[PDB]
From Swiss-Prot, chain A:
DNA-dependent RNA polymerase catalyzes the transcription of DNA into RNA using the four ribonucleoside triphosphates as substrates. In vitro binds dsDNA but not ssDNA. Belongs to the archaeal Rpo13 RNA polymerase subunit family. The chain holds residues 38 to 81 of 105 of the full protein. It comes from the Archaea. It is found in: Cytoplasm. This is DNA-directed RNA polymerase subunit Rpo13. Residues 33-43 have a biased composition (Basic and acidic residues). Part of the 13-subunit RNA polymerase. Coiled coil: none annotated.
UniProtKB/Swiss-Prot annotation, chain B:
Part of the 13-subunit RNA polymerase complex. Interacts with TFS4. This is DNA-directed RNA polymerase subunit Rpo1C. It comes from the Archaea. It is found in: Cytoplasm. Belongs to the RNA polymerase beta' chain family. DNA-dependent RNA polymerase (RNAP) catalyzes the transcription of DNA into RNA using the four ribonucleoside triphosphates as substrates. Forms part of the jaw domain. Reconstitution experiments show this subunit is required for basic activity.
Swiss-Prot record, chain C:
It comes from the Archaea. It comes from Sulfolobus acidocaldarius (strain ATCC 33909 / DSM 639 / JCM 8929 / NBRC 15157 / NCIMB 11770). DNA-dependent RNA polymerase (RNAP) catalyzes the transcription of DNA into RNA using the four ribonucleoside triphosphates as substrates. This subunit is involved in DNA promoter recognition. Belongs to the RNA polymerase beta chain family. The lineage of its organism: Archaea, Thermoproteota, Thermoprotei, Sulfolobales, Sulfolobaceae. It is found in: Cytoplasm. The chain holds residues 197 to 294 of 1126 of the full protein. Part of the 13-subunit RNA polymerase complex. Interacts with TFS4. This is DNA-directed RNA polymerase subunit Rpo2.
From Swiss-Prot, chain D:
One of its GO terms (cellular component) is cytoplasm. PROSITE patterns: RNA_POL_H_23KD. Its EC number is 2.7.7.6. It catalyses: RNA(n) + a ribonucleoside 5'-triphosphate = RNA(n+1) + diphosphate. This is DNA-directed RNA polymerase subunit Rpo5. It comes from the Archaea. Belongs to the archaeal Rpo5/eukaryotic RPB5 RNA polymerase subunit family. DNA-dependent RNA polymerase (RNAP) catalyzes the transcription of DNA into RNA using the four ribonucleoside triphosphates as substrates. Part of the 13-subunit RNA polymerase. It is found in: Cytoplasm. One of its GO terms (molecular function) is DNA-directed RNA polymerase activity.
Length: 44, 98, 98, 78
């Protein structure tokens, strides 16, 4: 539970950092965001 | 039954000088009505309406009580409202309390 | 300083500085020369209502019915890993002095 | 407990900010997104609107100085 939350936080930080550097555009950033949300909502 | 307002329990199962006083104390500590945490409630008149001032704090229990306006209840406890309503409500309550 | 407690389970304990922990009331009464429970309950008071409260404390010392058993109980409380003799004289001397 | 608390008089108005608006806010403020005040994803009001970690929640509050004041929070796991 706790480790899954930490992984969620780390991946969200990585996605935000990648988006802020213009590495990826907005729509794929949103797809990554909600894909991670759905993937880690199973444990919760 | 023994009288108009007096009775007696016989506890025929238990055979021990100990734990009989424990059963007596457990009986004396039994709740008959009301919600937990509240010590005493007093009805007061603010304007043209009637409010209840309570010496205890139990937010969820009062929300479960019929006849209570859930959207206008206010409490002195900040952690209770923080856990029940959220963090912005706790912020507003801290401001109002100060 | 000698401090007397009345615990939640309707028992009475006496504990002073020298002897660690609490000692039941009837134990000290037996160690001081009160062997019969009637003697204890009549030295306490002559009121039946007050005498009724001594029952848990009286029965909590039903195992110890002699002065020497109370004395070496106190000795075990104060002296650990010694024979019965030195234990009882140490207990009686600490009772008589402190 | 199915009692709805979003209508309580102590609860300001919460909204989920779109990705474009969040990006514009972060660029204009010159901050990393996690430098805003935090809000747990298990918060009752945040849960009532289906907030998820990584989003930015825009909160509108009553104010005696400007009427309505808008602040922002960052949704963290918890």
């Amino acid at each position: 539970v706790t480790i899954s939350d930490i992984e969620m936080l780390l991946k969200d930080t990585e996605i935000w950092d990648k988006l802020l550097r213009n590495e990826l555009s907005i729509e794929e950033a949103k797809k990554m965001f909600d894909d991670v949300a759905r993937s880690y909502s199973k444990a919760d | 039954d023994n009288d108009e307002y007096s009775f007696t329990i016989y506890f025929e199962k238990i055979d021990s000088i100990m734990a009989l006083f424990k059963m007596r104390e457990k009986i004396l500590n039994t709740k008959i009505k009301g919600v937990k945490g509240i010590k005493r409630a007093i009805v007061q008149k603010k304007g043209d309406e009637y409010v209840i001032i309570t010496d205890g704090s139990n937010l969820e229990g009062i929300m479960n009580v019929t006849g209570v306006d859930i959207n206008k209840i206010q409490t002195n406890n900040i952690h209770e409202v923080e856990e029940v309503l959220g963090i912005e409500a706790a912020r507003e309550l801290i401001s109002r309390e100060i | 300083q000698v401090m007397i407690e009345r615990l939640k389970d309707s028992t009475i304990q006496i504990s002073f500085a020298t002897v660690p922990g609490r000692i039941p009331f009837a134990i000290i009464m037996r160690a001081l020369g009160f062997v019969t429970d009637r003697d204890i309950v009549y030295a306490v008071s002559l009121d039946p209502q007050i005498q009724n409260e001594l029952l848990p404390s009286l029965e909590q010392a039903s195992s110890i019915t002699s002065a020497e058993e109370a004395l070496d109980f106190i000795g075990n409380r104060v002296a650990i890993g010694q024979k019965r003799e030195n234990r009882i004289q140490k207990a009686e001397q600490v009772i008589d002095k402190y | 407990k199915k009692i709805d608390i979003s209508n309580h008089e102590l609860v300001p108005k919460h909204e989920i900010l779109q990705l474009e608006e969040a990006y514009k806010l972060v660029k204009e403020l010159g901050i990393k997104p996690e430098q805003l005040p935090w809000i747990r994803a298990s918060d009752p009001v945040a849960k009532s609107i289906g907030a998820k970690p990584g989003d930015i929640i825009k909160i509108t509050r009553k104010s005696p100085f400007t009427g309505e004041s808008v602040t922002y929070r960052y949704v963290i796991t918890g």
